[PDB]
């Protein structure tokens, strides 16, 4: 067709589109926005990974209402009879059929675009009304169903294990604490809600580093909820250690936390494993030499193992996660840095010949990190909810009403009092726990 009444015709060129290198299906490196739509709706072939990647990452170079407009421009093919008959069986048909595949993928895996913009949804139902022709009058049956479904805001596969109880009796929420709940059931329950926190994170909340700017609270709410959860347990662990002023009760608390870690590492809950490692690394907890001096050497190895994960830019951690088999709760913080660095170390508009192209190679990399986050979000955990305990950990507010300085400072002053510097000698402190301090152990049945 004409190069003017249909803009998706301008021929390819080294100022319109660049492909990657290395074998028979092209991969886009950069491209103007028009070219990028054209390849998103190509007559010759469909590209599912392009479609997937594009709908995940376009909002940083083209606003969602622009996209809809392009997708319609792409659909209004004009007419130039024998080799114009091919111009219907081989061209307009595939294109138009590949616009509607976009619209279906769009309105079905990224519906948040239409939650946040009624007019965008309006135009789409308008546009899919204009769709006629019994070839697609069946794609439009599929998209409009999807639309309506989306407007309507346990089944364990195997048998869960039996729910371990230790001192605290079922139904007695008032006795629930670190040392009286069963260590196995603590790690189970934390891991349970920690996984559910992890699974809630939608890629709308990561792409664009949007959790690091003014509207993080509007846009990245379940990620923040997930980060704030693990911040609180780390602080709780710390408050439990240094607020146990007695040396013997403290070695009992540190011991019980390392044991939780143990079940954590058994469940492949790397988030909860790192909650504990961070606790043990804080400047209050790390300095208590007397308290670690009495840890069973088998336990010191268990913690040494976990801390070494973190060492060397998380090398051992990264290894282990790629080997273990789900269910699994990964540590989110690494994908956070990888997504920022990637978005900030690759240019937004690779320029060539004097015109800007949209760096889609940079977008593809961000999409890959997002994709990887999802592969760990699908397999759930074969463990039973103890709603009484879940409520206990849900409510942990170790910081009280204190700001973070006041509290961090307090936690350090407390470690200072209970194990003083070299000159002044170690005072002895009352017991506060009235129950016995022996670990029920970390084996079931």
């Amino acid at each position, epitope marked *: 067709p004409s190069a003017d009444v249909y803009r998706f015709a301008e021929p390819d060129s080294e100022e319109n589109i660049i492909f990657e290198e290395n074998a028979g299906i092209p991969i886009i490196k950069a491209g103007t926005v028009i070219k990028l739509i054209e390849r998103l709706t190509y007559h010759m072939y469909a590209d599912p990974n392009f479609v997937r990647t594009f709908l995940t990452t376009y909002r940083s170079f083209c606003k969602p209402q622009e996209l809809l407009s392009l997708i319609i421009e792409r659909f209004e093919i004009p007419e130039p009879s024998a080799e114009l008959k091919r111009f219907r069986k081989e061209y307009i048909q595939p294109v138009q059929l590949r616009v509607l595949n976009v619209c279906r993928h769009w309105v079905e895996h990224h519906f948040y675009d239409f939650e946040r913009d009624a007019y965008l949804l309006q135009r789409m139902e308008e546009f899919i009304g204009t769709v006629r022709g019994k070839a697609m009058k069946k794609w439009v049956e599929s998209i409009t169903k999807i639309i309506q479904r989306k407007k309507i805001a346990i089944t364990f596969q195997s048998s869960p294990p039996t729910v371990e109880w230790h001192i605290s009796r079922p139904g007695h929420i008032e006795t629930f604490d670190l040392l009286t709940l069963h260590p196995i059931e603590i790690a189970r329950q934390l891991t349970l809600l920690e996984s559910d926190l992890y699974r809630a994170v939608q890629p709308s909340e990561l792409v664009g580093s949007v959790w690091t700017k003014e509207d993080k609270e509007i846009n990245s709410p379940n990620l923040l909820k997930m980060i704030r959860h693990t911040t609180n347990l780390t602080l709780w662990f710390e408050k439990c250690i240094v607020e146990t*002023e007695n040396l013997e009760e403290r070695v009992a608390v540190v011991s019980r936390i390392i044991e939780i870690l143990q079940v954590f590492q058994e469940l492949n809950n790397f988030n909860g494993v790192l909650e504990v490692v961070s606790a043990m690394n804080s400047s209050p907890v790390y300095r208590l030499d007397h308290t670690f001096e009495q840890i069973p050497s088998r336990q010191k190895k268990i913690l040494e193992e976990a801390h070494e994960l973190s060492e060397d830019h998380y090398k051992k951690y990264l290894a282990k996660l790629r080997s273990i088999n789900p269910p699994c709760v990964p540590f989110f913080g690494i994908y956070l840095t990888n997504i920022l660095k990637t978005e900030e170390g690759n240019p937004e508009v690779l320029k060539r010949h004097g015109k800007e192209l949209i760096n889609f190679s940079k977008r593809r990399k961000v999409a890959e990190i997002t994709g990887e986050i999802q592969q760990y979000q699908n397999q759930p955990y074969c463990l039973r909810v103890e709603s009484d305990i879940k409520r206990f950990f849900e409510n942990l507010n170790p910081m*009280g009403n*204190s700001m973070e*300085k*006041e509290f961090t*400072d*307090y936690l*350090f*002053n*407390k470690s*200072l*009092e209970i194990e*003083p*510097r070299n000159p*002044k*000698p*170690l*005072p*002895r*402190f*009352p017991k506060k726990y009235s129950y016995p301090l022996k670990s029920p152990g970390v084996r079931p049945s």
Partner: nanobody
Amino acid sequence: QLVESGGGLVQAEGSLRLSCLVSRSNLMGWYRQAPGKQREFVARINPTGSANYADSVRGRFTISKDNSKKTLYLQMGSLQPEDTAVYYCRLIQNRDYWGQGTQVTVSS
């Protein structure tokens, strides 16, 4: 900055009062060292809430601070022989500022 003390010697069932001159998010207390025995915590005020006492001394001792006058007191009442110890003043702000510790020996 320094920490000070004021007390002395007195007989059983007495009412000895102790002082400290400190010369914000902090915590301060008292410790005593009975001779031949390990240093012992007696009491503290985390300004956050209230004060805690050692088990030995539950209802006989009481802590306080006149923020107006940079001072900290341990009130010792219903004294006994067993509390014969040097009694240290101690304020943890970002450093452990301790005190030399006046002597307190009680006879019957």
